[PDB]
Design an enzyme around this catalytic site. Structure first.
Site, PDB file in Angstrom:
ATOM      1  N   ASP A  65       2.396  20.377  19.161  1.00 45.79           N
ATOM      2  CA  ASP A  65       2.055  18.970  19.508  1.00 45.79           C
ATOM      3  C   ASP A  65       0.693  18.838  20.188  1.00 45.79           C
ATOM      4  OD1 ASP A  65       4.800  18.157  18.721  1.00 45.79           O
ATOM      5  OD2 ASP A  65       5.379  19.035  20.678  1.00 45.79           O
ATOM      6  N   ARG A 124       3.081  20.471   8.149  1.00 44.37           N
ATOM      7  CA  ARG A 124       1.864  20.294   7.329  1.00 44.37           C
ATOM      8  C   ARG A 124       1.600  21.584   6.573  1.00 44.37           C
ATOM      9  NH1 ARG A 124      -1.100  17.408  10.770  1.00 44.37           N
ATOM     10  NH2 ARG A 124      -0.381  15.591   9.647  1.00 44.37           N
ATOM     11  N   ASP A 152      -2.464  14.302  22.724  1.00 43.32           N
ATOM     12  CA  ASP A 152      -1.033  14.389  22.339  1.00 43.32           C
ATOM     13  C   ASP A 152      -0.149  14.833  23.497  1.00 43.32           C
ATOM     14  OD1 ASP A 152      -1.335  13.237  19.962  1.00 43.32           O
ATOM     15  OD2 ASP A 152      -1.782  15.104  18.920  1.00 43.32           O
ATOM     16  N   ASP A 187      -3.036  19.206  21.189  1.00 45.00           N
ATOM     17  CA  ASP A 187      -4.212  19.630  20.407  1.00 45.00           C
ATOM     18  C   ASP A 187      -5.452  19.304  21.200  1.00 45.00           C
ATOM     19  OD1 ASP A 187      -3.429  16.918  19.376  1.00 45.00           O
ATOM     20  OD2 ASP A 187      -2.294  18.281  17.937  1.00 45.00           O
ATOM     21  N   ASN A 242      -4.999  23.539  17.526  1.00 45.44           N
ATOM     22  CA  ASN A 242      -3.559  23.301  17.621  1.00 45.44           C
ATOM     23  C   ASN A 242      -2.950  24.282  18.621  1.00 45.44           C
ATOM     24  OD1 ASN A 242      -3.059  21.341  15.429  1.00 45.44           O
ATOM     25  ND2 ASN A 242      -3.985  23.043  14.188  1.00 45.44           N
TER      26      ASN A 242
HETATM   27 MG   LIG Z   1      -0.389  16.718  17.817  1.00 43.89          MG
HETATM   28 MG   LIG Z   2      -1.248  20.042  16.246  1.00 43.16          MG
END
Ligand SMILES: [Mg+2]
Ligand SMILES: [Mg+2]
Length: 174
Positions: free
Chosen positions: A104, A22, A119, A106, A86
Protein backbone atom coordinates in the site's frame (compact mmCIF):
# COMPACT_ATOMS: atom_id res chain seq x y z
CA UNK A 1 14.63 -18.55 -9.09
CA UNK A 2 17.39 -16.22 -10.55
CA UNK A 3 16.27 -14.88 -13.98
CA UNK A 4 18.88 -14.70 -16.79
CA UNK A 5 20.11 -11.59 -18.65
CA UNK A 6 17.96 -11.16 -21.81
CA UNK A 7 15.03 -13.16 -20.34
CA UNK A 8 11.59 -11.55 -20.77
CA UNK A 9 9.63 -12.09 -17.49
CA UNK A 10 6.24 -11.25 -16.08
CA UNK A 11 6.01 -9.35 -12.76
CA UNK A 12 3.03 -10.23 -10.55
CA UNK A 13 2.12 -8.10 -7.53
CA UNK A 14 -0.39 -9.44 -4.95
CA UNK A 15 -2.17 -8.08 -1.92
CA UNK A 16 -1.68 -9.67 1.52
CA UNK A 17 -5.00 -11.60 1.09
CA UNK A 18 -3.53 -13.42 -2.00
CA UNK A 19 -5.52 -11.56 -4.66
CA UNK A 20 -3.58 -10.22 -7.67
CA UNK A 21 -3.01 -6.44 -7.53
CA UNK A 22 -1.19 -5.65 -10.81
CA UNK A 23 0.65 -7.64 -13.50
CA UNK A 24 3.26 -6.38 -16.00
CA UNK A 25 3.48 -8.70 -19.02
CA UNK A 26 7.04 -8.03 -20.30
CA UNK A 27 10.28 -6.91 -18.60
CA UNK A 28 13.72 -7.70 -20.03
CA UNK A 29 16.24 -8.81 -17.36
CA UNK A 30 19.48 -6.72 -17.27
CA UNK A 31 20.95 -8.14 -14.01
CA UNK A 32 19.91 -11.20 -12.01
CA UNK A 33 21.72 -12.15 -8.77
CA UNK A 34 20.72 -13.79 -5.45
CA UNK A 35 19.95 -10.30 -3.92
CA UNK A 36 19.06 -7.98 -6.88
CA UNK A 37 17.05 -8.13 -10.10
CA UNK A 38 17.24 -5.19 -12.51
CA UNK A 39 15.00 -5.12 -15.57
CA UNK A 40 13.72 -2.77 -18.27
CA UNK A 41 10.23 -2.42 -19.72
CA UNK A 42 8.68 -0.17 -22.39
CA UNK A 43 5.06 -0.22 -23.64
CA UNK A 44 4.35 -3.37 -21.58
CA UNK A 45 0.77 -4.48 -21.04
CA UNK A 46 -0.39 -3.88 -17.47
CA UNK A 47 -3.34 -5.86 -16.01
CA UNK A 48 -5.43 -4.45 -13.13
CA UNK A 49 -7.11 -6.56 -10.38
CA UNK A 50 -10.45 -6.47 -12.36
CA UNK A 51 -8.60 -7.70 -15.54
CA UNK A 52 -8.68 -4.26 -17.28
CA UNK A 53 -5.53 -3.45 -19.29
CA UNK A 54 -3.40 -0.51 -20.35
CA UNK A 55 0.05 -0.15 -21.99
CA UNK A 56 2.94 1.76 -20.28
CA UNK A 57 3.81 5.06 -22.03
CA UNK A 58 7.62 5.27 -21.51
CA UNK A 59 10.71 3.14 -20.80
CA UNK A 60 11.41 2.16 -17.15
CA UNK A 61 14.15 0.38 -15.16
CA UNK A 62 12.84 -1.83 -12.31
CA UNK A 63 14.85 -2.63 -9.20
CA UNK A 64 14.02 -5.56 -6.86
CA UNK A 65 15.87 -6.61 -3.68
CA UNK A 66 15.70 -9.94 -1.72
CA UNK A 67 16.41 -8.24 1.71
CA UNK A 68 14.50 -4.91 1.57
CA UNK A 69 10.74 -4.49 1.78
CA UNK A 70 10.49 -2.21 -1.26
CA UNK A 71 11.00 -2.16 -5.00
CA UNK A 72 11.56 0.77 -7.32
CA UNK A 73 10.40 1.78 -10.83
CA UNK A 74 12.58 4.41 -12.57
CA UNK A 75 10.47 6.10 -15.34
CA UNK A 76 12.14 8.09 -18.16
CA UNK A 77 9.86 11.10 -18.92
CA UNK A 78 10.39 14.28 -21.02
CA UNK A 79 11.40 16.42 -17.98
CA UNK A 80 13.51 13.76 -16.22
CA UNK A 81 13.63 10.60 -14.14
CA UNK A 82 10.61 9.85 -11.90
CA UNK A 83 10.82 7.11 -9.29
CA UNK A 84 7.82 5.16 -7.99
CA UNK A 85 8.65 3.08 -4.93
CA UNK A 86 6.37 0.33 -3.63
CA UNK A 87 6.65 -0.85 -0.02
CA UNK A 88 6.44 -4.60 -0.56
CA UNK A 89 7.55 -8.00 0.55
CA UNK A 90 10.91 -8.87 -0.91
CA UNK A 91 10.52 -10.68 -4.26
CA UNK A 92 10.60 -14.36 -5.25
CA UNK A 93 11.13 -15.55 -8.86
CA UNK A 94 10.01 -18.73 -10.53
CA UNK A 95 9.22 -19.82 -14.12
CA UNK A 96 5.80 -18.03 -13.98
CA UNK A 97 6.97 -14.57 -12.80
CA UNK A 98 8.86 -12.37 -10.37
CA UNK A 99 6.35 -12.00 -7.54
CA UNK A 100 5.91 -9.76 -4.52
CA UNK A 101 3.22 -8.56 -2.09
CA UNK A 102 2.25 -4.86 -2.44
CA UNK A 103 1.84 -3.22 1.03
CA UNK A 104 0.00 0.00 0.00
CA UNK A 105 2.56 2.63 1.09
CA UNK A 106 4.44 4.17 -1.85
CA UNK A 107 6.90 6.98 -2.42
CA UNK A 108 7.00 9.13 -5.56
CA UNK A 109 10.25 10.95 -6.36
CA UNK A 110 10.15 13.82 -8.87
CA UNK A 111 13.08 14.73 -11.13
CA UNK A 112 14.01 17.60 -8.77
CA UNK A 113 14.55 15.02 -5.94
CA UNK A 114 11.45 15.93 -3.91
CA UNK A 115 9.71 12.82 -2.66
CA UNK A 116 6.22 12.30 -1.20
CA UNK A 117 5.08 9.41 1.01
CA UNK A 118 1.70 8.35 -0.39
CA UNK A 119 -1.17 6.06 0.66
CA UNK A 120 -1.00 6.28 4.47
CA UNK A 121 -4.86 6.20 4.37
CA UNK A 122 -4.96 3.17 2.00
CA UNK A 123 -2.39 1.40 4.27
CA UNK A 124 -4.40 2.06 7.46
CA UNK A 125 -7.62 0.69 5.83
CA UNK A 126 -5.99 -2.43 4.36
CA UNK A 127 -3.93 -3.13 7.52
CA UNK A 128 -7.26 -3.32 9.46
CA UNK A 129 -9.26 -5.12 6.67
CA UNK A 130 -6.55 -7.75 5.90
CA UNK A 131 -5.17 -7.91 9.52
CA UNK A 132 -1.50 -7.24 8.79
CA UNK A 133 0.54 -8.63 11.67
CA UNK A 134 2.37 -6.24 14.00
CA UNK A 135 5.82 -7.34 12.78
CA UNK A 136 4.91 -6.51 9.14
CA UNK A 137 3.72 -3.06 10.31
CA UNK A 138 7.08 -2.53 12.10
CA UNK A 139 9.07 -3.78 9.07
CA UNK A 140 7.11 -1.60 6.62
CA UNK A 141 7.46 1.57 8.73
CA UNK A 142 11.20 0.81 9.18
CA UNK A 143 11.56 0.32 5.38
CA UNK A 144 9.76 3.68 4.65
CA UNK A 145 12.55 5.34 6.67
CA UNK A 146 15.32 3.29 4.92
CA UNK A 147 13.87 4.16 1.48
CA UNK A 148 13.73 7.90 2.37
CA UNK A 149 17.40 7.65 3.44
CA UNK A 150 18.33 5.87 0.18
CA UNK A 151 16.62 8.66 -1.84
CA UNK A 152 18.41 11.38 0.22
CA UNK A 153 21.83 9.47 -0.14
CA UNK A 154 21.26 8.77 -3.90
CA UNK A 155 21.87 5.06 -3.02
CA UNK A 156 20.99 2.03 -5.20
CA UNK A 157 18.57 2.97 -8.03
CA UNK A 158 18.61 6.62 -6.85
CA UNK A 159 22.33 6.95 -7.91
CA UNK A 160 22.70 9.04 -11.16
CA UNK A 161 25.38 6.52 -12.31
CA UNK A 162 22.91 3.63 -11.76
CA UNK A 163 20.51 5.41 -14.18
CA UNK A 164 23.23 6.08 -16.77
CA UNK A 165 24.49 2.48 -16.76
CA UNK A 166 21.14 0.66 -16.82
CA UNK A 167 19.30 3.19 -19.13
CA UNK A 168 22.05 2.74 -21.78
CA UNK A 169 22.15 -1.10 -21.20
CA UNK A 170 18.38 -1.38 -21.75
CA UNK A 171 18.42 1.02 -24.79
CA UNK A 172 20.92 -1.38 -26.47
CA UNK A 173 19.17 -4.69 -25.61
CA UNK A 174 15.70 -3.36 -26.81
MG1 LIG B 1 -0.61 2.35 -2.83
MG1 LIG C 1 2.19 0.23 -4.23
Amino acid sequence: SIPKEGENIKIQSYKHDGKIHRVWSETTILKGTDHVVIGGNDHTLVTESDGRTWITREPAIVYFHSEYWFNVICMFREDGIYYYCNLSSPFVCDEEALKYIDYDLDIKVYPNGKYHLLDEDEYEQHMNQMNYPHDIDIILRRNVDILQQWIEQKKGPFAPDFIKVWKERYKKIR
